Amino acid sequence: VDKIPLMSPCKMGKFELCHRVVLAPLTRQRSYGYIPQPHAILHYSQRSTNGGLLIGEATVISETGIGYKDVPGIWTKEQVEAWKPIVDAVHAKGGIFFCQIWHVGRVSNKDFQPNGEDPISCTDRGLTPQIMSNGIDIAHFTRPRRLTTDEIPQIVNEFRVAARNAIEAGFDGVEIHGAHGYLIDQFMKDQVNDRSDKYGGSLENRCRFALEIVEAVANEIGSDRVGIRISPFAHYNEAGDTNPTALGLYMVESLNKYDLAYCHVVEPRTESLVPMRKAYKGTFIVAGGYDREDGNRALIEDRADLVAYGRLFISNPDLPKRFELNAPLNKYNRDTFYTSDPIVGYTDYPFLE
Numbered sequence: 001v002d003k004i005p006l007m008s009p010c011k012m013g014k015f016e017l018c019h020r021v022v023l024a025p026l027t028r029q030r031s032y033g034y035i036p037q038p039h040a041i042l043h044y045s046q047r048s049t050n051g052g053l054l055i056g057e058a059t060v061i062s063e064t065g066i067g068y069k070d071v072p073g074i075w076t077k078e079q080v081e082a083w084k085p086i087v088d089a090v091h092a093k094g095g096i097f098f099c100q101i102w103h104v105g106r107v108s109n110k111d112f113q114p115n116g117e118d119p120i121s122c123t124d125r126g127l128t129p130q131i132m133s134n135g136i137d138i139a140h141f142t143r144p145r146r147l148t149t150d151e152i153p154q155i156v157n158e159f160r161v162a163a164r165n166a167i168e169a170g171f172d173g174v175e176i177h178g179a180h181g182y183l184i185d186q187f188m189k190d191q192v193n194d195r196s197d198k199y200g201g202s203l204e205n206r207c208r209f210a211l212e213i214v215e216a217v218a219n220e221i222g223s224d225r226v227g228i229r230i231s232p233f234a235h236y237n238e239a240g241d242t243n244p245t246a247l248g249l250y251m252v253e254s255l256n257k258y259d260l261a262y263c264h265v266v267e268p269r270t271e272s273l274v275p276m277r278k279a280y281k282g283t284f285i286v287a288g289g290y291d292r293e294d295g296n297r298a299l300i301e302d303r304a305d306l307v308a309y310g311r312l313f314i315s316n317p318d319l320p321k322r323f324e325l326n327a328p329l330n331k332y333n334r335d336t337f338y339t340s341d342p343i344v345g346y347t348d349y350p351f352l353e
């Protein structure tokens with residue numbers, strides 16, 4: 001089989017990656033009681049490769065960052081200890097593991113919050129109800145409390161502490177979750193951020209929160225161990241922007257000075273990531289609808305340095321290998337993306353026969 005660009009080694013920060021197929025972050029809702037579980041050791045281990053980059057599922061930085069059931073956290077000593085074994089399994093196969101640190105912001109309900117308090121956000125406007133992945137149940141959200149100006153630095157601090165805890169659990173680095181309408185994207189998107197203080201009113205102001213987090217995290221553990229994910233063109237969670245391309249350009253240009261390990265950008269569903277890749281001086285990871293053919297073509301056209309896969313990695317533990325041999329791929333079952341079984345639809349997808 002002819003060699004392909006996707007299998008090419010890549011240097012990223014202090015890391016020497018052996019190939020460019022990246023495991024995208026994937027919330028699977030199987031971390032009972034918000035504590036990483038033993039079955040995660042196997043899941044991540046099955047997808048680990050020597051020098052392959054793995055980005056773990058969104059991980060909550062504090063009690064207020066919960067907007068879903070059984071997603072892992074990393075704010076307690078119990079959670080930190082539960083992560084170590086998982087981090088160890090990935091390391092045992094030569095993998096590079098980044099922990100994605102996350103806060104849902106207004107995408108939550110008072111029932112998920114400490115003492116039944118209201119979710120927090122850049123605004124005080126709640127989300128409209130959405131149909132849950134099972135097509136039957138409906139998710140309802142609580143109108144958030146608008147964070148005050150002086151409270152914001154305390155939230156930036158939670159990302160900082162989470163990043164430190166991630167390092168303590170053995171993670172190679174952390175990915176700041178700045179996408180999909182969650183807390184950070186809420187501050188960035190003008191359809192959401194109607195603040196009238198220094199954290200709103202302009203492109204620069206809307207991005208302040210995101211960049212303040214980058215700085216605190218980078219300072220806490222070193223920029224070469226930090227990455228960030230953004231989705232300028234995504235509208236998920238009523239978080240669109242009137243000028244996506246400019247929003248995106250602004251972020252990658254601002255991110256250059258931090259010398260991060262990488263910038264992970266989600267493809268638009270005329271919108272393009274070409275200008276962003278051109279503006280960003282570091283490692284560029286793209287994601288969103290890629291297959292073997294598109295992945296190689298993105299590298300050939302020099303649109304990215306790394307290509308992250310979500311859905312195909314869910315159903316193909318050995319995706320990098322399958323791509324390399326140009327082998328057939330298991331289909332993925334969305335019906336078990338978010339179910340809670342320790343094995344079904346989680347660790348029971350087959351390796352190349």
Ligand SMILES: Cc1cc2nc3c(=O)[nH]c(=O)nc-3n(C[C@H](O)[C@H](O)[C@H](O)COP(=O)(O)O)c2cc1C
Binds near residue numbers: 179309311
């Ligand atoms: C089941 C599932 C869980 C996801 N969980 C996360 C997450 O925790 N954090 C995140 O930033 N993106 C998350 N995503 C978005 C994916 O990382 C990825 O960007 C998206 O699936 C586009 O990729 P694809 O076409 O290769 O699947 C998730 C997607 C799916 C389908």
